[PDB]
Amino acid sequence: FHEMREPRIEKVVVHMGIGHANAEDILGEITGQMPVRTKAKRTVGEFDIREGDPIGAKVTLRDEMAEEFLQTALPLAELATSQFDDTGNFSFGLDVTVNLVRPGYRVAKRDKASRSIPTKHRLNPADAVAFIESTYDVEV
Amino acid sequence: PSSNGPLEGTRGKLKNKPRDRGTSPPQRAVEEFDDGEKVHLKIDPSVPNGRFHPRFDGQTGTVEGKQGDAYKVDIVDGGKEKTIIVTAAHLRRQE
Amino acid sequence: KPASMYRDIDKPAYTRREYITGIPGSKIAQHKMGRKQKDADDYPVQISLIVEETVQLRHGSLEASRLSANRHLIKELGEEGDYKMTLRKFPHQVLRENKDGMRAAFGKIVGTAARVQAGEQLFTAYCNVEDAEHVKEAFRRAYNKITPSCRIKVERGEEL
Amino acid sequence: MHALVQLRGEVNMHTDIQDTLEMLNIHHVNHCTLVPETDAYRGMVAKVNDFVAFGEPSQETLETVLATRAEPLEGDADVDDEWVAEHTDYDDISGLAFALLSEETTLREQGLSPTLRLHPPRGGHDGVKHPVKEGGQLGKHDTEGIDDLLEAMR
Amino acid sequence: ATGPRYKVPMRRRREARTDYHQRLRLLKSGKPRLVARKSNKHVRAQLVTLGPNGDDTLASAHSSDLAEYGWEAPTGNMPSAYLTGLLAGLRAQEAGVEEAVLDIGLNSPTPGSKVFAIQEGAIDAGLDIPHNDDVLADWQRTRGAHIAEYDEQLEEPLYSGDFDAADLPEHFDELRETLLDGDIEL
RNA sequence: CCUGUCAAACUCCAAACUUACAGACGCUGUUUGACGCGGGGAUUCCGGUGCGCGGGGU
RNA sequence: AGUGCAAGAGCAAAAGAUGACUUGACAGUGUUCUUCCCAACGAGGAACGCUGACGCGAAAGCGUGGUCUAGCGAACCAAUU
RNA sequence: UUAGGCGGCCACAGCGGUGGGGUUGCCUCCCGUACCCAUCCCGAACACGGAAGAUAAGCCCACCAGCGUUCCAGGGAGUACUGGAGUGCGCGAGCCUCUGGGAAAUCCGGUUCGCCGCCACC
Ligand SMILES: [Cl-]
Ligand SMILES: [Cl-]
Ligand SMILES: [Mg+2]
Ligand SMILES: [Mg+2]
Ligand SMILES: [Mg+2]
Ligand SMILES: [Mg+2]
Ligand SMILES: [Mg+2]
Ligand SMILES: [Mg+2]
Ligand SMILES: [Mg+2]
Ligand SMILES: [Mg+2]
Ligand code: NA
Ligand code: NA
Ligand code: NA
Ligand code: NA
Ligand code: NA
Ligand code: NA
Ligand SMILES: [Sr+2]
Ligand SMILES: [Sr+2]
Ligand SMILES: [Sr+2]
Ligand SMILES: [Sr+2]
Ligand SMILES: [Sr+2]
Ligand SMILES: [Sr+2]
Ligand SMILES: [Sr+2]
Ligand SMILES: [Sr+2]
């Protein structure tokens, strides 16, 4: 009952929103894998007349590459209560977003016979805080 | 009419009721009809290809062979006999 | 211009403002009169002005009949008196005038009119029992300024 | 079985209505036909309702009308009991009249003209501008009402 | 759902089970469909034709009924997939089915995958199915040589239940031999 | 929430009715040959009115 | 939402978006509808075939230009293959 | 169908909700990257290999009507509108009678929480 209901780290998205590149080298040193460029839609008046152009970079970390990052990323910032999603995810800062979920998330991410996760099996903000508090740091 | 194009005055007949919107079921698009069979002519708004002239919507013709995958259906427009090239997607069997 | 040119329902419904431009504003200043904070169910007496013939009543006639009706109620019951009158019809029908002979005859936009069917309530006033004969007089003045003959019908009131 | 009689002429009458009367074997004013009560025939009299007078006749009245106005398919010949005896599947006018009313046969099926060419109404009819319910002579009649008309048109 | 104008998808689209656009292009051939479906533990292969009230299956084969002929090995792999296709294809030849078109459903057209193995098996059984040779796996991977060379990196055994130690892809050969023989009870 | 109105170029609805094909009845055709096909000759292409439905216009 | 442009219509594992590849916007010849309801009339247009050669795809299949309805021109003469 | 596959009709099937169900069985979540294959970055997905664990998801089974939807009853309504007819009424816009058809909104009460086909399967 409790084993298939206890949270796990799905992905740690480390992103850098610049606007105009040179920030790719420092991400690959702190994370462990390769980063990808980020484009943008709609013409903006802040000298952004090009649609398909490198504005930022992101890194999606999974499994061991995620936990070995969070052991050195979480003690760098003070986690608040209002910093949580309605789904139970948190973002701080270099933007570091952590997507937390229950063991049956493949059902909404697979190709064949996919279904959206029920509101009861969806993670709560309170149930998310309890998991991180139980792993080397304080809440509030 | 203000213009004499094929799709003139066809707002009603070539539009779907909101619930019949989206891609149509494949079953009726692959239906096989035999020569001599009486078929009803009605354009499916969701299917672009294999259509006939909208003036012929509502006709009940007779299948008299086929041209490729499309059918050659004989109708009588007023008093004039015409042969219509039409795919199964726009045809329904009588009864 | 006389009402003889616009009183009948002889043209199609011409209301679509997305295809019609230059429509004159409505001369109707108010639609909710008296005490618009109080409810219609808070009054014992409900008297309506019923139109007998199917007609088109212009915004100028609506304002004239409403003004001559409400002005009597302001005179007899006071400016902040215990009554509430409603003009339920709005001038939706846009009117033209051909003002060149019969060539390019589609007229320019000159006004608006309210299509009221026979048997319908144009005005409806809610008052007390002692103010009932003052409102029947306000409607007597109001029917003289519109095109058809009218009925002053009491809907809620067996106090006679 | 109803008895149709044309009371209004062909001029200004709709072509599809005039054609229905011709399909019901009635081509002139005052001409009568004996029509069965089926779904198909009901649609036809309803279309002709305003130019006709119909209703179920009594055995007595039908017998009087057949005696005086029935004609063979071809010829002048009187349709009396002896004629009915020699050419029909019946014994007398009564046997024919009963079969017609019970919808067992038709006048044509028995070698008689489908049309009973009646005489104008003696003492006149109730009028060709109003129906029976309004005091006129058009539309559906009572059995007593159609009898008065057919007997007046002997 | 929200109101009268709301358009609820077709049932098999709502369930995310049928790609209706691919289905039409598949049905355009006029030939029966070789429905190649997978599961985590098993592999299915059906020969489906078109019917008035729904689809008609003329000859099927699941990897569970493979054991009926002598398969003591697992059922969700490459050798299993080929043999399930071969079994479906042979049952099809007895039903009168001579030609088919490969339906992979919502599975990916990845080179050398299990659904292409199901196809290679059905063709080898005598069915005429439009294929591409270089999209199919090399004969040794179909045998299960990739699983044997994975058991060479032993230390800890690959299979939990006792079948063998170093794995026998020779069982594939001993199964294709049994099915190619006409004396078999289908 | 409550309360007041609308649409030739709006529609969750929706007639009467018009309309394709077929069967049945009716009527019609097989000496009055219908339906249809081919050919000769036209006249005609200022129309009007009633009624129903209209559009423009006081 | 988007889908080049009126308006109305079509489209969501797409007809839209991104990416990659590609040149079928191909040659030849028809059937049919339209142009011109019924009901004769050209150019033009469209749908649907076949022959040839290709592109893409695992394949069915899709591609006879742009999701559909506008974007068009006789004889004579010239140039061109 | 003690949980499967392919479907037809394409909301009566939607939205939301409650309860129940899985030792060598089924579907899953699940476990895992040597390979076929894969991510413009991630075995997340796709692909492949596999069973330590689980019924919490999904899925299957039973059920609830609050919203949406289908059909039915009664009321609205034979009202609105309407094909045919009239030396019927009205100054007139228009109405009426006879005949043949006949709504919509809304309210109340029921129904609907899919039906059916082929295949496989203690
Ligand atoms: Cl056509
Ligand atoms: Cl599958
Ligand atoms: Mg229209
Ligand atoms: Mg004679
Ligand atoms: Mg006299
Ligand atoms: Mg008289
Ligand atoms: Mg010249
Ligand atoms: Mg030149
Ligand atoms: Mg459960
Ligand atoms: Mg008069
Ligand atoms: Na890039
Ligand atoms: Na559709
Ligand atoms: Na001028
Ligand atoms: Na003329
Ligand atoms: Na042409
Ligand atoms: Na479960
Ligand atoms: Sr007018
Ligand atoms: Sr007056
Ligand atoms: Sr019409
Ligand atoms: Sr096209
Ligand atoms: Sr994994
Ligand atoms: Sr007069
Ligand atoms: Sr007057
Ligand atoms: Sr009725």
PDB file of N, CA and C in Angstrom, chain D residues 3-5 32 34 55-58 61-62 64-65 68 116 118-119 122 145-154:
ATOM      1  N   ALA D   3     -68.174   8.209 -51.430  1.00  0.00           N
ATOM      2  CA  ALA D   3     -68.743   8.624 -52.703  1.00  0.00           C
ATOM      3  C   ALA D   3     -68.337  10.077 -52.989  1.00  0.00           C
ATOM      4  N   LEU D   4     -67.420  10.273 -53.944  1.00  0.00           N
ATOM      5  CA  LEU D   4     -66.944  11.612 -54.333  1.00  0.00           C
ATOM      6  C   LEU D   4     -67.768  12.248 -55.437  1.00  0.00           C
ATOM      7  N   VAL D   5     -68.108  13.529 -55.284  1.00  0.00           N
ATOM      8  CA  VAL D   5     -68.843  14.271 -56.313  1.00  0.00           C
ATOM      9  C   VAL D   5     -68.151  15.626 -56.514  1.00  0.00           C
ATOM     10  N   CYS D  32     -69.720  11.602 -60.302  1.00  0.00           N
ATOM     11  CA  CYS D  32     -69.463  10.871 -59.071  1.00  0.00           C
ATOM     12  C   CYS D  32     -68.685   9.593 -59.264  1.00  0.00           C
ATOM     13  N   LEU D  34     -66.983   6.089 -56.894  1.00  0.00           N
ATOM     14  CA  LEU D  34     -67.033   5.295 -55.671  1.00  0.00           C
ATOM     15  C   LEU D  34     -65.599   4.924 -55.370  1.00  0.00           C
ATOM     16  N   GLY D  55     -68.486  11.264 -48.735  1.00  0.00           N
ATOM     17  CA  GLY D  55     -69.042  10.601 -47.574  1.00  0.00           C
ATOM     18  C   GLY D  55     -69.526   9.222 -47.952  1.00  0.00           C
ATOM     19  N   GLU D  56     -69.690   8.358 -46.946  1.00  0.00           N
ATOM     20  CA  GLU D  56     -70.168   6.982 -47.124  1.00  0.00           C
ATOM     21  C   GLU D  56     -71.684   6.987 -47.363  1.00  0.00           C
ATOM     22  N   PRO D  57     -72.144   6.476 -48.526  1.00  0.00           N
ATOM     23  CA  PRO D  57     -73.591   6.468 -48.770  1.00  0.00           C
ATOM     24  C   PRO D  57     -74.278   5.248 -48.141  1.00  0.00           C
ATOM     25  N   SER D  58     -75.596   5.323 -47.987  1.00  0.00           N
ATOM     26  CA  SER D  58     -76.355   4.209 -47.432  1.00  0.00           C
ATOM     27  C   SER D  58     -76.642   3.228 -48.566  1.00  0.00           C
ATOM     28  N   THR D  61     -79.531   4.507 -50.806  1.00  0.00           N
ATOM     29  CA  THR D  61     -79.150   5.617 -51.679  1.00  0.00           C
ATOM     30  C   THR D  61     -78.255   5.172 -52.813  1.00  0.00           C
ATOM     31  N   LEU D  62     -77.287   4.309 -52.509  1.00  0.00           N
ATOM     32  CA  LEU D  62     -76.378   3.805 -53.530  1.00  0.00           C
ATOM     33  C   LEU D  62     -77.148   3.016 -54.582  1.00  0.00           C
ATOM     34  N   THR D  64     -80.326   3.473 -55.443  1.00  0.00           N
ATOM     35  CA  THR D  64     -81.140   4.403 -56.224  1.00  0.00           C
ATOM     36  C   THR D  64     -80.270   5.039 -57.308  1.00  0.00           C
ATOM     37  N   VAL D  65     -79.078   5.482 -56.902  1.00  0.00           N
ATOM     38  CA  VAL D  65     -78.097   6.136 -57.771  1.00  0.00           C
ATOM     39  C   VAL D  65     -77.565   5.210 -58.871  1.00  0.00           C
ATOM     40  N   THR D  68     -80.397   4.590 -61.604  1.00  0.00           N
ATOM     41  CA  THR D  68     -80.606   5.713 -62.498  1.00  0.00           C
ATOM     42  C   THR D  68     -79.378   6.260 -63.248  1.00  0.00           C
ATOM     43  N   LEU D 116     -70.355   7.896 -62.228  1.00  0.00           N
ATOM     44  CA  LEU D 116     -71.796   7.981 -62.137  1.00  0.00           C
ATOM     45  C   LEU D 116     -72.046   9.452 -62.468  1.00  0.00           C
ATOM     46  N   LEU D 118     -74.130  12.211 -62.527  1.00  0.00           N
ATOM     47  CA  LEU D 118     -75.341  12.736 -61.896  1.00  0.00           C
ATOM     48  C   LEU D 118     -75.963  13.992 -62.511  1.00  0.00           C
ATOM     49  N   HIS D 119     -77.209  14.257 -62.126  1.00  0.00           N
ATOM     50  CA  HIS D 119     -78.011  15.399 -62.572  1.00  0.00           C
ATOM     51  C   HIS D 119     -77.756  16.511 -61.539  1.00  0.00           C
ATOM     52  N   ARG D 122     -81.548  18.986 -57.219  1.00  0.00           N
ATOM     53  CA  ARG D 122     -82.927  19.482 -57.231  1.00  0.00           C
ATOM     54  C   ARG D 122     -83.136  20.307 -55.961  1.00  0.00           C
ATOM     55  N   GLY D 145     -76.186  13.227 -44.659  1.00  0.00           N
ATOM     56  CA  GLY D 145     -75.871  14.424 -45.435  1.00  0.00           C
ATOM     57  C   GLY D 145     -75.519  14.186 -46.896  1.00  0.00           C
ATOM     58  N   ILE D 146     -74.759  13.120 -47.164  1.00  0.00           N
ATOM     59  CA  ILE D 146     -74.348  12.755 -48.522  1.00  0.00           C
ATOM     60  C   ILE D 146     -75.519  12.139 -49.287  1.00  0.00           C
ATOM     61  N   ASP D 147     -76.396  11.465 -48.542  1.00  0.00           N
ATOM     62  CA  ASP D 147     -77.584  10.823 -49.088  1.00  0.00           C
ATOM     63  C   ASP D 147     -78.527  11.863 -49.657  1.00  0.00           C
ATOM     64  N   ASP D 148     -78.699  12.964 -48.923  1.00  0.00           N
ATOM     65  CA  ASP D 148     -79.577  14.061 -49.339  1.00  0.00           C
ATOM     66  C   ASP D 148     -79.067  14.656 -50.639  1.00  0.00           C
ATOM     67  N   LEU D 149     -77.735  14.727 -50.758  1.00  0.00           N
ATOM     68  CA  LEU D 149     -77.083  15.276 -51.942  1.00  0.00           C
ATOM     69  C   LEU D 149     -77.196  14.348 -53.141  1.00  0.00           C
ATOM     70  N   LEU D 150     -76.869  13.068 -52.952  1.00  0.00           N
ATOM     71  CA  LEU D 150     -76.944  12.073 -54.023  1.00  0.00           C
ATOM     72  C   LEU D 150     -78.370  11.792 -54.486  1.00  0.00           C
ATOM     73  N   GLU D 151     -79.333  11.889 -53.565  1.00  0.00           N
ATOM     74  CA  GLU D 151     -80.742  11.670 -53.891  1.00  0.00           C
ATOM     75  C   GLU D 151     -81.312  12.867 -54.641  1.00  0.00           C
ATOM     76  N   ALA D 152     -80.755  14.045 -54.359  1.00  0.00           N
ATOM     77  CA  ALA D 152     -81.173  15.287 -55.005  1.00  0.00           C
ATOM     78  C   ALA D 152     -80.575  15.367 -56.405  1.00  0.00           C
ATOM     79  N   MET D 153     -79.536  14.560 -56.629  1.00  0.00           N
ATOM     80  CA  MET D 153     -78.818  14.485 -57.895  1.00  0.00           C
ATOM     81  C   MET D 153     -79.106  13.182 -58.639  1.00  0.00           C
ATOM     82  N   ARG D 154     -80.311  12.644 -58.426  1.00  0.00           N
ATOM     83  CA  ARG D 154     -80.809  11.395 -59.032  1.00  0.00           C
ATOM     84  C   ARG D 154     -80.571  11.311 -60.538  1.00  0.00           C
TER      85      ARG D 154
END
